[PDB]
């Protein structure tokens, strides 16, 4: 994909995550955790809802009949009508196929970008206290308990608190 | 060895296939349909003052065919025409037939105004026929009068009838021309003299000649009564000059306002609401496209040559 | 301890709202309109050899109605028609009227050619009328002639008149058929004989017959004169065989080149220029769309059922916090 | 948004900057300052200019009148013309709404990417002499005077000059 | 000092220019055309039972002009009409001509059925003319008969002929009305009597009178023979009554099935296939658009006002 | 460009690389070399092939003639046909120009993203054993022979094998 996270460096999705679209899993001394990110989840949902509001609708124009169901109209004008309707039908079929194909591409890539923006937000927070493992996880080089893990999810993790301890473990 | 935090996204067992710009078999977590496939096999008339004509044809409302007796006047925002609707009890047709039918199906009602046409003692205006049955007896088009000579064989007198439109809206006037089956019939009804019918207003004029000629029997009758029509503007007069053959109007019509014409076979339903109709029923969908029929009326989804178009409402589904 | 360098982007206090695929209320730094709303209530005719007809109607140019005396001949790139324009002084109408009107409004000029129909000493060619007034008196359609009998009551003799087109291009020919108000009026002009007007050509044939009948008065006249027309080809002729009732052409027409037909009520303005026109003036915009009218002519922006469509010309406006 | 910079990790735009779309603010021992980036600004403007040149225009096709303003036409041909014109108008209304909605999304995401591209080139240039604070700034771990700050903006900053000093300040 | 690994992308010497949303002069490594500029100068008729009419006009197939003698009957899925095709050997025209041509060009074959019309001893039913030559001799429209009085000057007798459609499908019937040049010519062929020709069925009727009038000569003939037509429904009869002037049908037509009418100037080729045709030949391209002509028939690329639209099939070209 | 790699931080393309779309160049004690990456090359080629399948086709609607080639028709009905055909042609011309322009923008940016996704997977592979130079290269701080270079291209490079040596060489 365009941004390289979903169907990319993140190997696969989590069927066990039923309370959100994006989220965190972690492991520390205290336990194994899972939690959904509301902000990135809702950002993706709102954008898709906006498309549905835009796409799922019809025109206000009042169309009357120009073709009798139960009687035969004049032959020459009937051919002009048949030609014109088939031309308009080809335009709308093409427009519909393009619309959905375009939007499906953008929806998939938008979702991919939200995964990346969360990953990048976490990377910049952790600073020199963690390293990327390639699979979408961060190996944290200090003791990071449940409150520490929560602060990363809450976007209030302070890297300076653990910097000295982390640099010693990384250099070994 | 170290503590770790992993970023990820949800997935589902029940994936759905959608088409993108680059891929025709792309799996996503959720998707929704944009083309309506199913139709309600009923005419949804909630919030509509409607007229179901049954076996009455719209043109029959103006001339007054027996099947149209309960639909001679009225008001409506939706007018429904059915298959095999009876317009003419007597053999014949209307000139500019489809244009007249389309005008009636665009209107929002019909009002009837008397012509006030009177005829002298030598004219019999109560001509009837077995082709136009009404309560098991011979009758005629309710809004017209079959004029013939009172004495069989004698010449129909040179008659003049004029209608004046006293209203502020335009009036639709219809008349008929009888084309006899044979010369013997023609002489009995109108006399041996040469027949000539002339109509004339400010905006319209024409001459009609009754035609005796060999032709097959429709419902046992080789005769024909063809109809013609025009719009008389406010204040204008229309004059009929004739000496045998005219089927003269006793009333004229006034099309009131606007309405939605529907041609359909489906039964009526007053509980359901709709703004889009077709031959086989109604289309209530909120979706932008439909594949039911290219011929629809009202505020409709656009027709497309596609069974399904799935819009993705979710990310790529990457299971395991 | 550490020195700092920050990247950023610009902003403004109050931005502009635009629509996107995912958001209706999206704010941006600037945007620009794509749907034209305003219009000059004028006809912009710079670089255009135009012709304002006024009271004259296009069909009147071919037959020669009093109002169309100044506009019988000419050339142009733009022909302008007005409301309530007089085509017929004498009551009547043309068969295929709209087809003829669109032909004239498509052309870029009209030239006139004489038919050369002379008539014998038992024919009254200069038949005037009160409906078509000219110079404070009774007259007739300038490009036609009303043929009637010299002697009142006597039969109109079956005269023949033929016109050959000796030109490179097509020639449009028009004639009229009189429909008397009564048999008294019919017998005075044409006689008791049966009337029959059969026009004949190599690529056209039609038979016409006058119609006696009672009708209401239009301009104080119950009778009418209906007009008919056809195209006479190069190296070809058209023959009129008639015995009273035919309104014969003294001249015929030739439509030159091409031009743009505008039906509008707004006045001419020679200072401005424009390529798009409608009933209420000109559309001089550079924008792709407009919501003035679906009925336009020329090289126009496309009509849309939209008041506004703002195209973004900048980034998202993320303003600084306010107390 | 898609690239995460504008309305993302950069908290808000600078209303004071009125000589450019993107730029730098710095703080060193000598003082503060502001300076717009020409190259990224011009890239954003040039792309938007290309959209306006492409979008703001009409077709060369000359259309004639098929409806009479000052007189009536045949009833059946008038219905066909009314059906066709409304059908064509529904297509152009839809296409116009889709065009501008699609272009606005792309213009916004394009400008977001140019902010990110400027952030990325600066990061790669500073190399190991600075660290990201997460809010679109770089904390530089050496004495970087106004001439040093100019070399970052003009793209002539050599990381090896200050590398020895910077790693000692980072390791601490 | 350190080892290094560099990442990069390919490039080419000569790039291709394409257009994007933001750039009119965008160079890419490869691009491909989307608007077709070229056409095969042939009607590609492989996999098609076709018919090249040559100098036969479609209307000439029904009345039976000499040029159409090989095209009076047949079946086809494609019918090819050519420029300057001859419909009428004798001077004249068909009323409602273009609609009749379109009906024949939409058909997939023609059958012919005998009217069975016969005429009395005083009528000569084998009238011929110099304009319609066949086998180096005088002849007439093969599916019609010029009826005239056998003895020159004698009155043409009152004749009534009826054709019944015995088929389950709709039949098409044509006839002509001779409009003579002079009054003496009319009297020689038909007589001094006033002429009248009536035609009538259940769904159609009309009257016709031969008109004597001087007019310009076409191939040395100031007289005319104008044609008229109608559709006769299954079971219905059509009756002709006439006393001189009728050009009566000996046979009627049945339009069978459906087919693709093509008007073109290009020669046939049975070695290859196509689904799109125009005046100049066939369009066998796989591309979605074309700039050859706005007038095409079949399954075609959409016409556009563009000489070229290059679609990028590669990245930005950034050469060394 | 949107992702910053092609026509961005990678100065130019390689004309010599005829065996693929994206690839690697290296240098070490043994010498220089070149190789194409099959995965990223095929990812781009498959997506363009997908576009061609969707775009390079026509509708299967059978159209009949409404304009006679070899004869005239009524002037009014002919004007309606001409108006309708020119209106339909304006829509298809517009729709063709928009499709190709939109698809060309996406194709260019897609290709730009695949280059970036490859660059990103190599960065995370190398982890703390290498540094970015800004021009699309990674300066590896240990002895990386032809086999070591092959493992980076093959996605089997183990960072922990060289971590000790590399961290010492980076800090100096
Ligand atoms: C053997 C055969 O087929 N003979 C027909 C003969 O039936 C037919 O006579 C007409 O038959 C019909 C039945 O379908 C009616 O009985 C006709 O009578 C009426 C009618 O009811 O229509 C009586 C009515 O009083 C008449 N009204 C007026 C105002 O005159 C009408 C009227 O004359 C005719 O409808 C005008 O055509 O007829 C009865 O005449 C005859 C005539 O069609 O033809 C034989 O071949
Ligand atoms: C006191 C009295 O009753 N006098 C009548 C007198 O009105 C009548 O004159 C004719 O009246 C008719 C109907 O009103 C027309 O108005 C006639 O006018 C013209 C016209 O202007 O249209 C005069 C013109 O010279 C005529 N032109 C030609 C070529 O003949 C035309 C023409 O006849 C008609 O338009 C044909 O439809 O009519 C006006 O003469 C006379 C008539 O004999 O009788 C008095 O007793
Ligand atoms: C001196 C001069 O210009 N005289 C013409 C004179 O030629 C012309 O008569 C017609 O001329 C043509 C061409 O030469 C034919 O010869 C006409 O003869 C036929 C025909 O072949 O068409 C003979 C045929 O046997 C006739 N068939 C029947 C069924 O009657 C027809 C038929 O009468 C006519 O076609 C009916 O219109 O004619 C010959 O009549 C006359 C008449 O156009 O005009 C002079 O000026
Ligand atoms: C316009 O198109 C309609 C639908 O394709 C045509 O109507 C069909 O006509 C065929 C006979 O050729 C019948 O078998 C079908 O049952 C008809 N279908 C419907 C839905 O009516 C119609 O003939 C075309 N008009 C013209 C003038 O050719
Ligand atoms: C799938 O999308 C539809 C349409 O937006 C929505 O109504 C539905 O809730 C979604 N389904 C699930 C399981 O989330
Ligand atoms: C939008 O932005 C500028 C700056 O506010 C404004 O002056 C102008 O009207 C617009 N510029 C363009 C190029 O559309
Ligand atoms: C076509 O639309 C115009 C404008 O809305 C309307 O006045 C007219 O009645 C319509 N034509 C027909 C035939 O109904
Ligand atoms: C360029 O793209 C076209 C797409 O049709 C393809 O046929 C061709 O092989 C591609 N490559 C070259 C080098 O032409
Ligand atoms: C339709 O356009 C063509 C363009 O060549 C022109 O020849 C033709 O005259 C036009 N039709 C009408 C009725 O003007
Ligand atoms: Ca058809
Ligand atoms: Ca209408
Ligand atoms: Ca035109």
């Amino acid at each position: 994909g365009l941004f390289g996270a979903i169907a990319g460096f993140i190997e696969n999705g989590w069927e066990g995550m039923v309370d959100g679209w994006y989220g965190f899993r972690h492991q520390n001394a205290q336990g194994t955790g899972q939690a959904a990110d509301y902000k990135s989840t809702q950002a993706a949902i709102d954008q898709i809802t906006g498309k549905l509001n835009r796409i799922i609708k019809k025109t206000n124009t009042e169309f009357e009949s120009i073709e009798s169901e139960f009687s035969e109209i004049d032959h020459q004008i009937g051919n002009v009508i048949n030609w014109t309707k088939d031309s308009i039908t080809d335009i709308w079929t093409y427009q519909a196929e393009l619309l959905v194909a375009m939007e499906n591409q953008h929806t998939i890539d938008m979702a991919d970008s939200e995964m990346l923006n969360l990953y990048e937000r976490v990377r910049k927070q952790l600073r020199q206290n963690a390293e990327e493992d390639g699979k979408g996880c961060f190996e944290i080089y200090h003791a990071c308990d449940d409150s520490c893990m929560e602060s990363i999810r809450n976007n209030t993790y302070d890297h300076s608190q653990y910097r000295e301890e982390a640099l010693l473990n990384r250099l070994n | 060895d170290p503590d770790k935090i992993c970023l990820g996204h949800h997935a589902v067992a029940n994936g759905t296939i959608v088409k993108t710009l680059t891929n025709e078999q792309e799996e996503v977590t959720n998707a929704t349909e944009t083309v309506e496939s199913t139709s309600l096999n009923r005419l949804c008339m909630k919030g509509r003052n409607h007229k179901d004509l049954g076996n009455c044809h719209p043109i029959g409302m103006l001339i007054g065919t027996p099947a149209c007796d309960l639909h001679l006047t009225g008001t409506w925002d939706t007018l429904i025409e059915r298959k095999n609707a009876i317009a003419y009890c007597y053999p014949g047709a209307t000139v500019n037939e489809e244009a007249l039918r389309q005008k009636i199906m665009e209107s929002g009602g019909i009002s009837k105004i008397n012509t006030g046409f009177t005829y002298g003692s030598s004219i019999n205006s109560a001509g009837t026929t077995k082709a136009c049955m009404r309560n098991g007896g011979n009758s005629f088009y309710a809004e017209l009068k079959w004029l013939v000579s009172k004495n069989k064989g004698q010449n129909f007198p040179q008659t003049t009838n004029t209608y004046r439109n006293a209203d502020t809206a335009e009036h639709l006037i219809m008349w008929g021309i009888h084309h006899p089956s044979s010369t013997q019939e023609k002489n009995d009804l109108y006399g041996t003299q040469s027949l000539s019918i002339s109509v004339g207003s400010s905006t319209y004029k024409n001459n009609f000649v009754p035609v005796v000629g060999a032709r097959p029997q429709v419902n046992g009758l080789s005769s024909r009564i063809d109809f013609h029509w025009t719009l008389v503007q406010p204040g204008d007069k229309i004059t009929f000059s004739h000496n045998g053959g005219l089927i003269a109007p006793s009333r004229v019509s006034k099309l009131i306002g606007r309405g939605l014409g529907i041609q359909s076979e489906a039964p009526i339903d007053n509980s359901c609401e709709s703004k889009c109709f077709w031959r086989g029923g109604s289309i209530n969908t909120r979706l932008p496209f439909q594949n039911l029929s290219p011929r629809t009326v009202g505020q409709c989804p656009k027709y497309v040559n596609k069974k399904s178009l799935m819009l993705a409402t979710g990310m790529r589904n990457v299971p395991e």
Side-chain angles (χ1 to χ4, degrees), chain A, chain B:
Chain A
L2 278 183
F3 296 93
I6 297 171
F9 68 78
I10 298 164
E11 294 184 58
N12 54 74
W14 300 328
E15 292 177 37
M17 183 162 284
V18 297
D19 59 338
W21 282 29
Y22 311 100
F24 304 84
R25 281 181 178 172
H26 74 257
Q27 183 60 49
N28 59 12
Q30 292 198 279
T32 307
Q34 185 179 281
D37 189 64
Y38 175 81
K39 188 158 279 170
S40 61
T41 292
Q42 201 63 33
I45 290 168
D46 288 356
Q47 286 186 77
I48 292 158
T49 304
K51 292 183 179 195
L52 293 164
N53 295 341
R54 211 185 87 264
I55 299 161
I56 310 305
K57 52 138 63 63
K58 54 176 179 176
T59 62
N60 298 313
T61 315
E62 186 80 344
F63 288 99
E64 299 188 324
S65 190
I66 60 168
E67 276 189 289
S68 182
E69 297 287 353
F70 313 129
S71 56
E72 287 188 32
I73 68 190
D74 187 44
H75 194 89
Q76 183 158 17
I77 196 68
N79 280 327
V80 173
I81 293 154
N82 278 12
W83 190 93
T84 307
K85 288 194 171 189
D86 284 12
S87 294
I88 295 285
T89 292
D90 277 352
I91 292 159
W92 281 112
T93 304
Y94 200 79
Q95 202 82 238
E97 283 176 353
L98 184 62
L99 180 82
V100 175
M102 186 209 292
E103 295 284 10
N104 290 353
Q105 197 74 67
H106 190 262
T107 296
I108 286 160
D109 296 327
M110 178 274 294
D112 195 12
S113 81
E114 294 298 337
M115 184 73 270
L116 184 61
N117 294 343
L118 182 57
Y119 176 84
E120 288 290 300
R121 181 260 277 181
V122 171
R123 184 185 63 76
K124 293 192 191 81
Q125 264 203 113
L126 294 173
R127 195 147 160 179
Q128 302 300 309
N129 304 359
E131 294 179 13
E132 300 163 85
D133 78 337
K135 304 296 200 296
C137 306
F138 295 93
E139 299 188 342
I140 307 159
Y141 288 85
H142 60 92
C144 184
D145 70 337
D146 284 14
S147 292
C148 169
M149 293 289 182
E150 189 173 34
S151 70
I152 296 159
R153 298 197 305 274
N154 292 4
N155 200 19
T156 65
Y157 172 84
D158 179 27
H159 81 102
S160 64
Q161 187 178 6
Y162 315 101
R163 190 185 169 81
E164 190 169 41
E165 189 193 339
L167 287 175
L168 294 164
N169 292 330
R170 287 180 68 196
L171 299 166
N172 197 279
Chain B
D1 186 31
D3 299 336
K4 65 194 293 192
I5 185 163
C6 290
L7 283 294
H9 56 89
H10 77 150
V12 291
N14 59 326
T16 313
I17 304 298
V18 300
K19 296 187 173 183
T20 72
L21 296 170
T22 64
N23 188 7
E24 60 159 35
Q25 295 285 306
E26 191 72 67
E27 193 180 319
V28 295
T29 58
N30 191 24
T32 189
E33 183 62 70
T34 63
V35 181
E36 185 59 57
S37 285
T38 53
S39 183
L40 300 169
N41 205 327
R42 292 188 305 284
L43 294 173
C44 304
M45 306 312 298
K46 185 170 161 67
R48 286 171 178 277
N49 180 31
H50 76 280
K51 178 165 280 286
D52 186 1
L53 295 168
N55 71 335
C56 167
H57 195 272
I59 291 167
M61 302 172 91
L62 307 181
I63 64 178
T65 315
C68 300
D69 283 327
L70 307 178
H71 313 283
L72 294 175
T73 62
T75 52
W76 55 81
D77 52 56
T78 304
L79 188 60
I80 305 161
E81 183 193 328
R82 308 300 194 175
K83 194 183 181 188
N84 309 127
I86 299 161
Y88 319 110
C89 44
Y90 202 87
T94 305
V95 177
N96 298 328
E97 198 175 50
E98 186 58 28
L100 184 58
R101 193 203 70 85
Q102 284 185 324
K103 270 192 161 290
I104 295 161
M105 293 287 280
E106 286 171 44
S107 74
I110 296 166
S111 279
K112 291 280 163 64
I113 297 95
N114 289 343
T115 57
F117 279 19
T118 63
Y119 308 97
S121 51
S122 55
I123 293 170
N124 174 18
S125 59
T128 61
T129 170
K130 202 195 292 187
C132 303
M133 297 294 289
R134 191 178 266 105
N135 251 329
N138 290 5
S139 189
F140 197 63
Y141 295 103
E143 316 294 22
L144 306 168
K145 291 283 172 291
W146 197 339
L147 311 180
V148 298
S149 295
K150 181 166 278 176
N151 298 322
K152 187 159 62 56
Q154 296 190 169
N155 295 318
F156 194 101
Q158 182 61 51
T159 312
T160 303
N161 295 101
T162 301
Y163 173 69
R164 186 181 171 282
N165 184 1
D167 207 336
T168 58
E170 69 181 344
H171 282 192
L172 204 164
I173 180 158
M174 293 199 70
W175 64 98
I177 308 291
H178 178 228
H179 301 277
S181 61
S182 65
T183 304
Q184 176 53 34
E185 184 185 284
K186 179 261 170 191
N187 296 336
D188 289 11
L189 302 180
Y190 315 111
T192 54
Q193 54 94 351
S194 191
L195 306 174
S196 180
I197 303 157
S198 275
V199 185
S201 70
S202 294
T203 61
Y204 173 89
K205 73 193 161 292
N206 211 328
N207 190 58
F208 305 97
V209 178
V211 184
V212 178
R215 43 168 181 275
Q217 293 178 340
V218 183
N219 205 50
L221 294 162
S222 297
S223 283
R224 305 283 183 268
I225 293 169
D226 292 349
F227 302 102
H228 303 86
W229 61 277
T230 187
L231 277 301
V232 182
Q233 302 303 324
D236 188 26
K237 311 100 180 65
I238 187 165
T239 303
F240 296 84
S241 299
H242 58 109
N243 62 338
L246 182 60
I247 303 300
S250 62
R251 302 206 291 182
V252 291
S253 302
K254 180 172 70 172
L255 306 181
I256 296 161
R258 286 277 290 180
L260 183 59
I262 303 163
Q263 283 170 306
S264 178
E265 301 182 47
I268 303 296
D269 193 291
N270 295 298
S271 64
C272 299
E273 190 176 306
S274 191
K275 296 198 187 78
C276 182
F277 305 96
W278 72 296
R279 194 206 182 85
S282 298
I283 300 169
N284 288 8
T285 192
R286 313 198 308 99
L287 301 178
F289 314 119
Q290 58 94 357
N291 62 33
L292 288 156
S293 175
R295 295 181 309 286
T296 63
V297 290
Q299 295 173 36
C300 288
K302 301 292 174 189
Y303 183 73
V304 292
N305 300 132
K306 257 285 181 295
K307 289 191 286 296
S308 179
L309 264 167
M310 299 300 289
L311 186 64
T313 59
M315 67 183 67
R316 275 193 176 95
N317 193 41
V318 194
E320 308 190 54

